[PDB]
């Protein structure tokens, strides 16, 4: 939880394609000193992993859509079971248990407007305990970065 | 739109921090032969870039919250203004313009439940055009991966 | 308004590509007798015209979307002017002045989810007098026939 | 995806009832040379078919009305059932499955305002799954053309 | 252009509604024809259905019913007859003079007349919300009645 | 209030065209006796007058439509203007000023849906300072009686 | 009610920890005199007791959340069960049974948003015959005083 | 794991809330330490902020306030301070003991106490709906109070 590392944190999420060469340079250390420090950050918990970003506008997935799901609270394992079922599906980026008129907010991604339809009713609406599902297609995404705010 | 490149992609996202040789190790290729190919993907538009994923639990953003915002269609630049004004605010991660009741959906991470009350109506409600702002706090984030679905085929 | 013509009406909208050869045959007359009758129906008002149907799933227009528009009643020519402005736009199949929470129901058609966005705010939301616009994209069209019901 | 075929299409829709030669008259082609080409479009999938457009004002369908229907998500076959049950009803023209509040949008033409009250709750409300049905009658239809947008280019 | 409604029967109708107690004799004078021909005339109108009946008008102020209020009933459909069950259930309460099934955000527009506000509050819910399956209700108390005439528009040409 | 009177009113309300010889038989009294009572029952102000009921469907007013009208909150006088200016309009059968999200509620009848579109805007929207105007066509007028509730006890 | 008493209550409500020597100075009377009054003021039942106010933020209860709970309309006894079974739950600060779209309203406090997710479902959803359960986290508790309104006049 | 709250100050707190009039002496006995050390102890707690103050509890039944009702206020945002203007405006009416700004379908959850139903009806609108810009309101009358304790949860370990 050292403060000096915060720089190694921001730059790292800024360009995962930065080896000790440039990573352990812009910071203010040598290719070994803190490069072993950013390594410790990978185990400490900070860095959970690394990944590359892509533009679905290319790979069949140029269509993003959110889905509000409201399932009827029946058996105590209502959510527990749901979560341990929705995760087993990769065609859905996110999913959160919120508070209000609905319970979950899935963020599924698909190619065409036709694809999504097929996703729901076949599996999405086939999830355990679902009762109502309001679909919201995004006509324009103006911001999307899992990057946090490191000072 | 290549074949082997697909596995390349799937591999890079399954693990971004990979060495040149390792990146072309279990893919079915030779070191020098195919490891720089990724550059054409980065030049064209396949690879948008690379980034590290940190745990918001161990950083100053332990709390997450969504918001349904509705912009008042006053001037045609109603949307244009919102967009070119919400980006500057690093407090919010994802921002979308959807169809339906509300118009925008913002996924924001405020360190504390109060911080959000602060973010809201001090830099949030004061956004270019806005009628209502229904907020939905997340009690349990169960899935969160910006990873797409690359399928060999 | 002859009854016997109703058959010539249904078949005609059933296959516009039916010349006197087959059209003036299935009915029960000769290639001349009523073929001159279906001609009269074209002037009488019944037949307004003929057209061919296509599947946008091919030609860039595989994305259909409805838009509820609610404009603030300001000057008496509020609708009059609107209608004499929205018609001058071809990228919109239908448009009706309804009664209720909103005033109009446009049926615009476009290629990608990105196209539509560009349509609105640039022109759609630029229409004279508009104040609120709720967008509804169709994820699945299960029926679409301008065909009426002739008995 | 041809060039001249585009003008062909635009012409056919601008006027379906056209003779073989006339269909290839002002397009920039010769009679026999290009008039049967349309067949490949009809065989492939470009031309869905031809139809005549009659005035609902002079027929027994002078009145038009839209309806926002919401189906209750009970069984996954909730949609499948609605679909394979609304087609059989020739009383309704267009039926769509949209996203948002309600789920379906039906454009129907009932001869008289009463006829609709009849159509509704006698063959309408009794459809496979349904919670609410908000109706919006049309006071003035200003635009109605199934014509698409073919642009030369 | 049909209907073919007698140029004279029209005036008859307009007259009867304008005044529902007019004598046939005077009536026949106001329309021209002899008394007898007018009687079997209004009769054939009162027969067909053009005329549903006659009634007297009372002052909603001289009798406990001064307060007039409108209500909007948006009910939940779930028994393909709900609109019928509801309808054939509001015809039993004289405390409501008009019930209509309109399109839009709500389904029913009711016109109710009660003496007090608390008289309405009573009618509301204790008999109103309890009506055949209904979600919520919007209430609009009349502040002033500028126009109110059940008179139709007979085109006496 | 005289019970026989209250009974006269009721009977009369049920049907006023009835003869005194009949109205007398109902209340159980000689013709003249209460016929002079129904007379004073008028003069006093209990009976605003008599009228016949006509079926709109048979004539020309099958389309009954209620309109919700709101006025500009600017000049306060507008309302008083609106009032004495909306009575003249024959097509407007009833107009009430209520308290709530809107200001007035007009009950109008017309033949064609077009007729309405004509009324609205050519004269309806041109009314003394009008802001909003929401329309509600009726699908079924399940009840319409100006009859009050008199208790014959 | 004695004005001095009503004044004693109020003063006491404002702050009860104050000494009698002080509470006596406020009401303008010798210590003993009304100190015996505040005593009978207790015994009678006007004062349910005394308590200190603690800031939740400082301790561990910065997340205050209200939950709307509905029960199964089956067995009527459930409610009586729910009641005497929900009091034991320390995390549930307040529970009221109201009339409306839902049955109860519980005010609970927890440290982490996780803590809530834990409560809800592990014990909260396991309550005596519960049907629906809508949660409402609070962003700002702008007012919280069990103080009543006593009129010192 | 911080805060570092004295194992003894905790019991102090729990005690003070359990009973707000306890004598310091008795208090010091209940926690162990001598009276004096306990006094400058509760003081440093009453100083920092752990303790906001002391109050007596009155019977909402022996005083006109028997009826308790909850209301849900969903207001319209349009003056980026509306939430502040509203908040700093509900703190002037003692007839409302709890006002919270929660997420979801509505914005405010208020807890109001009035003697009569008509007393509430009065508070409602005449002072309620008139509050700093608010759309509509939902009302929930308490039928029975099963649990009600402002007591927090001090972990005396």
mmCIF file of N, CA and C in Angstrom, chain B residues 99-101, chain D residues 99-101:
data_model
loop_
_atom_site.group_PDB
_atom_site.id
_atom_site.type_symbol
_atom_site.label_atom_id
_atom_site.label_comp_id
_atom_site.label_asym_id
_atom_site.label_seq_id
_atom_site.Cartn_x
_atom_site.Cartn_y
_atom_site.Cartn_z
ATOM 1 N N UNK B 99 -32.169 3.853 -25.365
ATOM 2 C CA UNK B 99 -33.519 4.162 -25.789
ATOM 3 C C UNK B 99 -34.449 3.696 -24.689
ATOM 4 N N UNK B 100 -35.589 4.359 -24.547
ATOM 5 C CA UNK B 100 -36.533 3.969 -23.519
ATOM 6 C C UNK B 100 -36.964 5.177 -22.721
ATOM 7 N N UNK B 101 -37.275 4.968 -21.447
ATOM 8 C CA UNK B 101 -37.705 6.062 -20.588
ATOM 9 C C UNK B 101 -36.576 7.062 -20.510
ATOM 10 N N UNK D 99 -38.265 -2.775 -27.502
ATOM 11 C CA UNK D 99 -37.633 -2.708 -26.201
ATOM 12 C C UNK D 99 -38.169 -1.471 -25.510
ATOM 13 N N UNK D 100 -38.228 -1.504 -24.185
ATOM 14 C CA UNK D 100 -38.724 -0.357 -23.452
ATOM 15 C C UNK D 100 -39.767 -0.790 -22.449
ATOM 16 N N UNK D 101 -40.725 0.086 -22.171
ATOM 17 C CA UNK D 101 -41.779 -0.228 -21.216
ATOM 18 C C UNK D 101 -42.541 -1.421 -21.742
#
